[PDB]
Amino acid sequence: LLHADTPRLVTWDAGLCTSFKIVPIVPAQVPQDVLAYTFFTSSYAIQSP
Amino acid sequence: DCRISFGMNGAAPMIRDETGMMVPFEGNWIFPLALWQMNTRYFNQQFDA
Could you tell me where this protein is found in the cell (chain A) (predicted)? Predict the structure, then answer.
């Protein structure tokens, strides 16, 4: 009663706001036979969201 | 946009005109250098032969 725990109101996010994300489960057949190795952008190592 | 599609099972490989029709690797083409700088690391292997 004499002194109250003041709460933390003003809080900040410098990172991006979201709440979901996209996780892979099973990887792709990055080497295979019917398709050449150079179709895939992972062969040239370009990242992608 | 320029979308390389490989010719499956001996077919001709394929890039797409901006008009919509897919076009094979011949003739007289008009790039911008920004379009080359998009994917030059892919385009060297796709075009240089």
Answer: Virion
